[PDB]
């Protein structure tokens, strides 16, 4: 895995070349906004679990096929499954926030998951509806815009930060698509 | 890659955990050792040139039986892949300083290196005398601030460790 | 799907063996047990409507605070649900006396239970109050006979026991 | 694996329905002629070493350049992998009887079974003629007519579970095919 | 197929090793050994047929019993793919002979032997009358040198050894 | 694996033949030829280390793209995964040099390999130069004609042995290509 750093180096060692100061300045603006993307992870990661549970229930109130016989979050096994998933996509997604970069996301998710869902027949575009949801969770955490729950932050503009992790979440379903 | 954000990233995925406390504490320090060995980085990608010239020459000089026939120096082109070598691995500090850890060092640089330089028959010696020399040759604060000389020699002594 | 034929024939398959005596004399247990467990089915099959409304309302009765805002079933559409529940639970009872093994409720309603009902918060006590009220409502010889009654309660103590 | 139970209550998942008395006419009578189903099971596994034996061995003198070099049988390491075959392939049929079903035979048994003949080069043709020759055998056995060798039985009309196994034993050419 | 090159080739193989002088030691043991158990291979080849009428003829005679109905021998036909067999083990033994190993026999005779000779109720002891005939009839010097005798008689031992 | 001997016993096997006189002149010369093969193998496996070096070398100062950045030798890990693979193949083709027979370079080292490479973006046009610079290295070893070293041998003609090892290099390109 890369992160927003060695990302430029990556690219860098590409043309043979040193990273100087005119290649800098995106990497000392990333520090110098750096407590700013500790506090949107915090604010993933503190309501993870209503967000998984909240997006899956959504994918299901929206199309309660899933639930029938036959549809593809039918018995309890079924539905813990895609909870766990839901739990995992959630995951990489926040490390992709935290290094800034999505090569962890792609590789070690995202790699394999669509012939994954083929095989078992996991609807890919109901998974898309809820990793779509969980996109608007996130969005309204990190902008501390959630109608239900509000967190404690320093004012200030996280527009860049929401912008970014609705990149990572948009990822998933260009993957399974 | 190694570095303070990919090895608590990796720790936690290992675990099938979300980022906690720790992480975002680890990464916090990031921010407090950035400006040390950036500045590191910005003065060796201003200067490499003239750096991998001195530390070159000083493998040369220190061990002129190189230059001899069939030794790893015999001829001009073996001379100047030499210097491209030193050129290569200051190149890979440089990275070393802006990902805040040892991986492009690790990767591109040390990985399969005892046994390329045991099969060209290159001895490692030579590269130790110029990574050494560079290390010796550092003035602070002439030529940086101390905790950018601290985070360039740490590199540095890392590569010659790795070669030894 | 565990069932006596199925335990019998896939620890033959383990051992890469014919079915022998020990497999037939199993599989007469069958024979044996049939008959009750098969009238606790028809019983069920045919009457599962009034006892899954006795069996939710009295998990409602239990736990009114279960109708609170932001409880469990806070609203109708909760509610619903929640009888659904308890009905698929006593399909899949019927579905255990028919095969004459736990297979059905192992696989399509134990299997991942913890985690769902643990990350939708829904209370385990509740579905515990549901299972266990159609237990104690039994009445042999009134219901079913008392073989059919041992085998019903059997199932229903398993899941009781499968949540606890 | 499903056996014959098992397989109604997966039909009537599928339609979220009891399985009740209309259901189970079917089962009680499974039930009630289970001794005989026993019987047929005993008296195929009972004669199995010769079953698998003597129908390797028909195939061969049918088509004897099996054994010449270059045929699938030549060398004891095969023709002691075929006997092999021919024994595991009659365990999973003699399961499927035992339970009145033929997942478990599909499943454990005949799921990739031709893709691996394929690729190891085992005529399928010839494996259909060893199955077709034990299928006779098998249903001799059921019946108590088999030429050379008599069993026990209170007499009684097994058509149906000689139909049945030779339904299993059709099972393996059409996979194979 | 085991012979002296495919064993030190193998063994170099699992070690990631290059050939080194014991490996072309042991080859050179292949250049000594050669002429005996090639003069051993020419008079099979040479005179197979008479070798293998012998041998059958030998079981038969020891063995009378083969030829009762439901017994391994009861018809012609039988009695031909016993003899056939005879012959087929015989070559293997010529094969042995000239690889200089027991890689033929091995991997085309003595693998699956014992299944296939239980499962179609071939006795063992028939296959040991044919073979031990032959190891004792062998005539030294008449058939062959000394050393031709002990390179042919080995690989009978071997396959006597192999079915006991 | 096969070697010359075991390579005539398959032949005749698949006839059903003996091997006999009219059949093992060839092998007669094998053996009577042996101190020369083991002598040509000894003059390979006596400087394989500066065949390899050589060769990956000469592969580079030809194509000097190899390590350029993106270059498939660039970076230590990479020569070393080269120099690696140098010396496996000259390894196999000393085995097969040794045995008189391909079988064990086919089965062992070159099965499989061209897709290795294709799956990891390994050059096969830059591999198959690297193995013709250590045919051209093996023939001038065989024949005591290297023009930096000299070995000591009992004078004698060593073409045939030249002929086979180049056939063995060959097939590598084949392999590969
Ligand atoms: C079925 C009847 C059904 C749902 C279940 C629900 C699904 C849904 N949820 C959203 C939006 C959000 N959900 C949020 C989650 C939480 N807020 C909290 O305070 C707790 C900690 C947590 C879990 C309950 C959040 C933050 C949002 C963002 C909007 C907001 O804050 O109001 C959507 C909208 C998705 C979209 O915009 O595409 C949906 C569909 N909806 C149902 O219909
Ligand atoms: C080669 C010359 C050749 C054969 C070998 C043989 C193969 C063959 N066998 C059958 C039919 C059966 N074989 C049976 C086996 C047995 N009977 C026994 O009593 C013992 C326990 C056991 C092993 C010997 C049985 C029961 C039958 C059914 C018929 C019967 O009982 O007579 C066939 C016929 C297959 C068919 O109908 O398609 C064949 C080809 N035949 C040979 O030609
Ligand atoms: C780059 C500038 C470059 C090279 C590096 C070099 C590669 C090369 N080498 C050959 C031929 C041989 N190399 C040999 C190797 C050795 N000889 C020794 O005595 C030591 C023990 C060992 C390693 C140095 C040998 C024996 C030969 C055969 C010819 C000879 O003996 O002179 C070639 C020619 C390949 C061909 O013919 O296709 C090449 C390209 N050449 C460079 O340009
Ligand atoms: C969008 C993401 C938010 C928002 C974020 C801001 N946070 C700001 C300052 C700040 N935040 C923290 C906590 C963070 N740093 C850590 O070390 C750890 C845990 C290890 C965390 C969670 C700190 C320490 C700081 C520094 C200031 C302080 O000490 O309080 C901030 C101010 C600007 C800046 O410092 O860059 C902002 C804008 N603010 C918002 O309004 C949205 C909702
Ligand atoms: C076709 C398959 C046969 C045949 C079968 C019949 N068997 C009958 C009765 C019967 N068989 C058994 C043995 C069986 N039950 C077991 O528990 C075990 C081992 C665990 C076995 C092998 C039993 C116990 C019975 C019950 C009667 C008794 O006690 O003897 C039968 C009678 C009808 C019925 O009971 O359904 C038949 C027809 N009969 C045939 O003629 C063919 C050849
Ligand atoms: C082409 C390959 C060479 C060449 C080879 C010849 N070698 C000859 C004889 C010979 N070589 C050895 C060494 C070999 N045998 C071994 O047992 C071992 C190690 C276990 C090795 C490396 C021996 C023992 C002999 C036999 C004669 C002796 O004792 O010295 C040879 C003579 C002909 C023959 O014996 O077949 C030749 C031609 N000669 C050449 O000029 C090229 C360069
Ligand atoms: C009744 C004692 C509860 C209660 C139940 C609710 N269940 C809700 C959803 C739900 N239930 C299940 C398990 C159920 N589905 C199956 O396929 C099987 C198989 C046997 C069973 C038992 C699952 C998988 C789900 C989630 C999918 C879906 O919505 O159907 C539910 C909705 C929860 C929510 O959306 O937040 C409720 C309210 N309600 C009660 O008050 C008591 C505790
Ligand atoms: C939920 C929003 C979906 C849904 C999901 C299901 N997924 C099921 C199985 C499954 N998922 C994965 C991929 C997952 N595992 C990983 O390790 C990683 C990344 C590291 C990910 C993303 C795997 C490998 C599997 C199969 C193994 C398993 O069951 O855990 C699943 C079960 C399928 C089945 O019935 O066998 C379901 C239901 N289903 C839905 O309807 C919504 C759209
Ligand atoms: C240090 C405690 C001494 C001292 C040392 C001097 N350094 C001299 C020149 C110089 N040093 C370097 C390498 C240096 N520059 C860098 O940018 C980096 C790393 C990024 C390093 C290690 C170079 C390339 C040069 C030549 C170009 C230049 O003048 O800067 C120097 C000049 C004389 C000489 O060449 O020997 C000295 C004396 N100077 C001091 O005052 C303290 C005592
Ligand atoms: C038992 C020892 C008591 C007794 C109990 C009564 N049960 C009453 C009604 C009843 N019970 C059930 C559930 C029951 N029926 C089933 O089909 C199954 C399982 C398949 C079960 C557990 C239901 C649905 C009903 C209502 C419909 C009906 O009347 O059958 C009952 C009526 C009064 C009441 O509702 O409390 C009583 C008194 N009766 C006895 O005599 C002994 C002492
Ligand atoms: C001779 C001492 C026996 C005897 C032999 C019979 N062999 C029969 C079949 C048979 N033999 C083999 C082994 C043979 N095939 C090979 O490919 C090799 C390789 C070295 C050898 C030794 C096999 C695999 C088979 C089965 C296939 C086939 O029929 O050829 C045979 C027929 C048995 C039957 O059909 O029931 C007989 C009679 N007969 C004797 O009386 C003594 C004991
Ligand atoms: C006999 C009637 C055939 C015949 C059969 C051969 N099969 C050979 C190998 C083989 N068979 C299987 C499938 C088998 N193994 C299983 O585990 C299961 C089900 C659980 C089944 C049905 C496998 C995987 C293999 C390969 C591994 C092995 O050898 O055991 C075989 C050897 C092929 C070879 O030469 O390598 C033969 C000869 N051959 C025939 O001519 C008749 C038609
Ligand atoms: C040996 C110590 C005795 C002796 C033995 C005799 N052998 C007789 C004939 C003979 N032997 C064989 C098998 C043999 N020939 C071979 O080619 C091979 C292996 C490659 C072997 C084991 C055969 C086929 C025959 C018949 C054809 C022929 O005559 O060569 C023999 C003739 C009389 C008889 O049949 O009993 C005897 C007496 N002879 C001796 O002088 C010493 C004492
Ligand atoms: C050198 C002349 C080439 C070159 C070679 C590279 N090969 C690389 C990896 C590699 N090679 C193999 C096959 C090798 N391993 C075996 O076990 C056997 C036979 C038993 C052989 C021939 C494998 C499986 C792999 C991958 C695993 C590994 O790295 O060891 C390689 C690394 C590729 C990468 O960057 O990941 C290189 C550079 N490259 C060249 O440019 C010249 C033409």
Same mark, same amino acid.
């Given at each position: ?177 | ?28 320090? /990031? ?15 201003? /200067? ?19 230059? /001899? ?96």
């Amino acid at each position: 895995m890369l992160d927003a750093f060695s990302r430029v180096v990556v690219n860098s060692d590409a043309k043979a070349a040193y990273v100087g100061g005119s290649d800098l300045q995106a990497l000392k603006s990333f520090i110098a906004d750096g407590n700013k993307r500790l506090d949107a992870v915090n604010s993933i990661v503190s309501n993870a679990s209503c967000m998984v549970s909240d997006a899956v229930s959504g994918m299901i109130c929206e199309n309660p096929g899933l639930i029938s016989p036959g549809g593809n979050c039918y018995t309890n096994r079924r539905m813990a499954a895609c909870l766990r998933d839901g739990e995992i996509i959630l995951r990489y997604v926040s490390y992709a926030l935290l290094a800034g970069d999505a090569s962890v996301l792609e590789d070690r998710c995202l790699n394999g998951l669509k012939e994954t869902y083929i095989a078992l027949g996991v609807p890919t575009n109901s998974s898309i509806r809820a990793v779509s949801i969980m996109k608007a969770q996130a969005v309204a955490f990190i902008t501390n815009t959630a109608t239900e729950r509000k967190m404690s932050f320093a004012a200030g503009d996280c527009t860049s930060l929401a912008s970014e992790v609705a990149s990572y979440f948009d990822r998933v379903g260009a993957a399974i698509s | 890659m190694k570095s303070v954000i990919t090895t608590v990233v990796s720790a936690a995925d290992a675990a099938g955990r979300f980022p906690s406390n720790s992480d975002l504490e680890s990464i916090q320090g /990031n921010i407090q050792r950035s400006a040390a060995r950036l500045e590191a980085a910005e003065k060796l990608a201003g /200067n490499h040139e003239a750096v991998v010239k001195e530390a070159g020459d000083a493998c040369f000089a220190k061990y002129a039986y190189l230059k /001899n026939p069939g030794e790893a120096g015999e001829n001009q082109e073996k001379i100047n892949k030499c210097y491209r070598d030193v050129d290569h691995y200051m190149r890979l500090v440089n990275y070393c300083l802006v990902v805040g850890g040892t991986g492009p060092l690790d990767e591109w640089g040390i990985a399969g290196a005892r046994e390329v330089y045991r099969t060209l028959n290159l001895p490692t010696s030579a590269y130790v005398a110029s990574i050494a020399y560079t290390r010796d040759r550092l003035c602070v604060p002439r030529d940086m601030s101390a905790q950018a000389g601290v985070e360039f020699s740490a590199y540095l002594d890392y590569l010659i460790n790795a070669l030894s």
